[model samples]
Target: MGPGFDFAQAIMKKNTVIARTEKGEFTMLGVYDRVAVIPTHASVGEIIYINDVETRVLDACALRDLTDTNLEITIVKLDRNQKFRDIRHFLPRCEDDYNDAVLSVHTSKFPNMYIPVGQVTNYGFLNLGGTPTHRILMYNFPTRAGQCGGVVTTTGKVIGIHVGGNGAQGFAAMLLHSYFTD
Candidate 1:
């Protein structure tokens, strides 16, 4: 079959909403020192401002879905120039066993999405032979069909790429942030 998709021309606009909360109204012992009210979820994705008509290919990996669960992703920021060198050394000889364990935990918890295939057993030394801090442990399990490129996090921020195992690994690379950013 030939490529089958329809493109529709339609004008669209953005939407917004707001809400408020009150505290100290219902107290147990009538002792209210301070009350604080904060917006549950406020931030929205980035908005692009175009000066002229342009065509662009949307990078799917860079655009995170709001409905996806949030987790704190632990990351070790390296020297800007060292990213390439560091990633290269870190990825090749990573520990497979560690990855298997982490994947087991993730699969047990999520049960429906593709998980990372490998783990970052170590990340060199934090302070030159002192101790390695920038390390990760990935899981190597067969991703269920129709599951790939799922999110992975440690401290609510996206840190690792969830490359599927074996046949599914393709999905992982496709969802990697580096694939979109770099």
Candidate 2:
């Protein structure tokens, strides 16, 4: 048998958030809206292919280039990470397990981009709970003491904003993205 783990502490401490949907109950953390200063040091080179197969990069330097052309921009730093899980009683049947697996695979595929927080370096996705469940990448690095958040876009329109992740890793905050926003 698998070793039993107790989540009573997490439950009692109010670490989770709950959301109600037509389908049922979904656990998640309330999305936090924030403002941050864009990191000046980030370059186009930093935006490398996150998924080797996808051929898409974040392109922070591209944003910089746009700013030089007089585009208005904003960015911020985030110091925390968000985890999501489902505790619904029915429907999907194994919703929690499924979501957890999705989060795990996502993290493993993008290691350096999303990491754990603090010096101890406890890694992987964490469940803080709400509706429309999702995970936030957090990372920790010695040079930087806290988390950071920012916005990215093309054609002067906001495409996405970034939310803090595990330690030093950060995730895109795309409000309209079906994967996370829906």
Candidate 3:
């Protein structure tokens, strides 16, 4: 059935992303943030990103706009709030270590007709910032999906979410690990 319906392709590009402030302003746009995965909630209505290849954020858990222009973890939910490949879609797999290669979605590269691809690179837990205890997975996330919501994995399951960027490289956050059920 046409390669058994690329479940990863549609979901990879269709749904996922980051921010949209009250006045419809995205936090920071770079080559990657050329676009973003717009955020909205049932509580916060009107998630309109007209003229943008948009996806839906089903569950908006948290949104924290950091006080400055640096690395900050903005938490939100797109899973645990849907049917037909919802919760299991964004589900995370536990891994003590992941190296070699990873699969990712880059909306900037292919906004409307996007699919996931794999890349191999070095990875580790280190916070180059001032936070003495801050550690997260490191990688170069795809453009639009990075600012929006891109999942990174090696074993066909999520290890981190590419949620933010700093012009060149992408930053990720590990899953909550205890929120959504299986």
Candidate 4:
């Protein structure tokens, strides 16, 4: 990304919306205008606030057999490492594609509002920690302080769902298969 990038414009390309837990957990993601795909590890079903709007998780996938056929799998992380059961995929209410994770990460730490950010710098996940929880997606954008459920995209394509980040390194549930059991 170089001179000729539009952050505001980029934000408008997809249906990515901000989500939060009832207790004040913040996150971001891409939704289907109604449903959303959240992580099983960070899964919340009873009640969730989407963009400050009260919403409900119609359903999610859970693995029982823990076989290679289970659509939904568990991902776990220990004190210093990552560990989990299997893999699962979900969809947003807006009907967004699960594999539309935009890879061209927005480059610019702390955002360009302070500067011209003259050019559109591009980048992606800063670093994958040791078995944290969900797959991490880091960027240079200023939207770092734990913006979970935030949608990450490039140009106009979706890449990952902004689950959460410690500081510069946020997390996302990178899905490639539509394996979430109905």
Count of steric clashes across candidates, in order: 14, 30, 4, 40
What residue runs in model 3 are displaced by over 4 Å at the alpha carbon?
1-10, 13-60, 63-84, 87-90, 93-95, 100-135, 140-146, 166-168
TM-score: model 2 vs. ground truth: 0.20
Q: Per-residue lDDT for 118-167 in model 2, tens only?
A: 22211223332221223222223321222222322221122222333434
Rank by TM-score, descending? 3, 4, 1, 2
Provide the RMSD of all predictions against the true structure, rounded to 1 decimal: 21.3, 18.0, 8.8, 11.4
Query: Candidates' lDDT values, in order?
Result: 0.22, 0.24, 0.38, 0.37
TM-score of 1: 0.23
Across residues 41-148, which tens digit of lDDT does each residue of candidate 1 receive?
A: 111112211212121212102122244422212121111121111121112222222222112111223332223344434321122113122222333455553232
Task: Output the lDDT of residue 23, model 2.
Answer: 28
On TM-score, the candidate that comes out on top is 3
Residue 77 accuracy (lDDT) in model 2: 19
For candidate 4, the TM-score is 0.45
Per-residue lDDT tens digits for candidate 4, residues 81-170, read 222222222222222233223322221222222111111222222333333242333443444443444444433334455544555333
Candidate 2 — worst ten consecutive residues by lDDT sum?
Answer: 96-105
- The true-versus-predicted C-alpha distance at residue 65 of model 4, in Å, is 13
